[PDB]
Amino acid sequence: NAVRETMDVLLEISRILNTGLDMETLSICVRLCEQGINPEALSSVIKELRKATEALKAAENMTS
Amino acid sequence: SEFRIHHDVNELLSLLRVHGGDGAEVYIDLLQKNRTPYVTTTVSAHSAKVKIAEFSRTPEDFLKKYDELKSKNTRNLDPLVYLLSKLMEDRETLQYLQQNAKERAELAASAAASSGPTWQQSLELTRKMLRDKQSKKNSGQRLPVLPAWVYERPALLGDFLVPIGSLPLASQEAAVVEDLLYVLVGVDGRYISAQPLTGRQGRTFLVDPNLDLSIRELVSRILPVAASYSTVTRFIEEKSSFEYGQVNHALAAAMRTLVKEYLVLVTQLEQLQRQGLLSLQKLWFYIQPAMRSLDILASLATSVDKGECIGGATLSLLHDRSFSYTGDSQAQELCLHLTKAASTPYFEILEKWIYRGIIDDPYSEFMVEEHELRKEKIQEDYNDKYWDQRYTVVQRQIPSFLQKMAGKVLSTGKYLNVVRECGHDVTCPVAKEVVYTLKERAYVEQIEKAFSYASKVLLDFLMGEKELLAHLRSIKRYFLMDQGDFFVHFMDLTEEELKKPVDDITPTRLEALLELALRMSTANTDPFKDDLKIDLMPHDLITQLLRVLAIETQQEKAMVHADPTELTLSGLEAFSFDYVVTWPLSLIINRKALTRYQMLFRHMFYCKHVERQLCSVWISNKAAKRFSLHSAKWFAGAFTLRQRMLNFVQNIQSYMMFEVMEPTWHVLEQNLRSASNIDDVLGHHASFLDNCLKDCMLTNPELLRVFSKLMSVCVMFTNCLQRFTQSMKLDSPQLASSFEATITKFDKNFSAHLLDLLARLSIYSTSDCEHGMASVISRLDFNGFYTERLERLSAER
């Protein structure tokens, strides 16, 4: 419950930051950070993957 | 039922006037191993239809019915059509059937003479009948049915319910376009009219006389799609009925979604129409794009309605259509889309049934429907259904793709409904979204994992909540002792109750004796004792066992239907045992299965009591060693008789103890260890039961009667010995009349009965060979001193 509450507070902060980050992404990021993943690497990969997902979504919308 | 051949095929032999030959009994046997829950009729049905029409003397009705029977879209018309064609092939078979039938037809005839389509009405009858049918299926529930006001407001969808005498050809085309656009919007034409649908129809057009012959011909193409669209709106409303179904509602809504496309194209053309820049040929060009699509859409709707497709009826029709809509690649994909969507209307419940282990049956679309079956009454009932009818299977309701896995799906759903009846209702973690897709093997692919998970969960729950290991480590003490103290107290305490006749037995005293014997042993490590008790039968173990062995064999009414009330209530054979386990907690022992597991106790304890009586006679016969038994003519022939009868009874018990016992018991242990499903555990237990009773040899009425006669001779000999002891030790009437050293004659009779029993064992080892019969012969021929004489009497045939 402590991890869940911490994740909820972090998600609230991120929503205040207007990041549009998911709770599942938050949990995955918590696991990566405890695993020793660079916050900069995680955020850069997140931005690149968000851009790729947006491009794929646009392409599939034109691909319907 | 499973013996429905008796009702159909046996009466086929009798009533068909075919008593010679095999009749339709061997035909019943032929169709029995050829009758499947599903259908595998893949065949060139066109070829079979051609053959039938070729042999059809009046092929008009043959071809007409070849179309008409598909109107209802009934169950497996292809097999009947093939039968009707192939039977016309054999005139000899046809003529022989004519002999079998026409003569009976003449007999019956002689015995006889001695002594228009309104869409409104056709849909209202359907709606009322479907409301009644949904009420019957509800069996005491309400319905989210369409309202009476929904039926009211006629033309609730706003349904489709000009002088052109000398119009210029262009103005005529424009006015005709206006009329046709109104018709496409379900409105009246300008110079022409359109009668309403003649029941199942759109609008039966009435072309204007002033409409040019060329104009009328061009409009003729439009009118098809117009009637199609009107009937399509009507069919969408029909599927919108809750009686049609929530899935039918989903299909109708998907159609409405495409119907928006229809009105969209209407407005797209209306753009040029308001612009006045359209043309009759231009319109025909634009209509061709989807004029065919209009009729294509109405096609599947008419298929569902004409088949009254409820449940997997419309699903199968849809899947078949999707498999055939090729060529019309647009319809090949559109029907696939509709299939994939509307699967979820049932596939969610299917997922619910499959995944959630709880099938939602507001409409009972899933073939598995949780049929009412009280699992509690299974154990105490000789015939039970809950283990097999806690979830009935509606074979009539199945989708096209679903029908393949349905049997495997039936097993998986049965396991899931078992998990639901286990209290711990649960969703299978495999929740592969049930939906329609082209991959049919994929439908069963995740189904395989789901069924495996269901079976594994069932196995784990049985190893948990059921915990049958203790239910058997304790039942080992039940009906088999497996410990001297297990049944030692029962033997030591039931003596007085059995001495009291069955009419003379005191149930309260028996209850007290049972409770005390329950506390009288240190083998109470088994915790399942409360699940077990004692009981009694108003008939001897023989009184019903031999009646069944002579199953209308020789005493259908002489002894099997003869009530035990013809005899008296005897304490020993009337006795019985009691035990039970809850519905979820192993209601396995139904009174038939429970009786099968119980009566081994009766037979074993009968032999135990006989051996106890023999041992008591011998222990009381401890004084005769202090002198010469030669002076005990009424008490020393007892020694010879005891020697001759120990081989008959005590030695007969050893074959059951080792040869009979180890096989069935070890088979049950090993098979249960290999058991993974409920069926596997049932097989292990069924081995332990059937094979054990087989080595008990308690199912051959003649041989069992011979063994019973030997045991009864032994019992009567023990009783006569006890009576002679009572009349002699008190001598230091009836008991003295039992024997006066005539117990020597009784021992001779026992030896003769033993010779007969050895002959029965030899008969088993000769006509059936076997190993148990060869062992019975081997135990009889221990030494020739009482076996070489038996061998000679065996040759005395």
């Binding site: - | 009749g23 032929l30 169709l31 043959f62 029977l69 018309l77 093939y82 000899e92 022989y96």
Partner: protein
């Protein structure tokens, strides 16, 4: 049951005994080969 539809199929056959015991065998989904052998045997009697 569909006794009416069975009679409809029989009139479609247009022969000369509802014969729906065979339709019961169809409900059991008996095989055409055993069905043909059984029909020949029942014809012979």
């Amino acid at each position: 049951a569909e006794e009416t539809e069975l009679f409809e199929l029989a009139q479609a056959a247009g022969g000369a005994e509802v014969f729906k015991i065979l339709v019961d065998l169809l409900k059991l989904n008996v095989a055409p080969l055993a069905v043909f052998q059984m029909l020949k045997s029942m014809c012979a009697g």
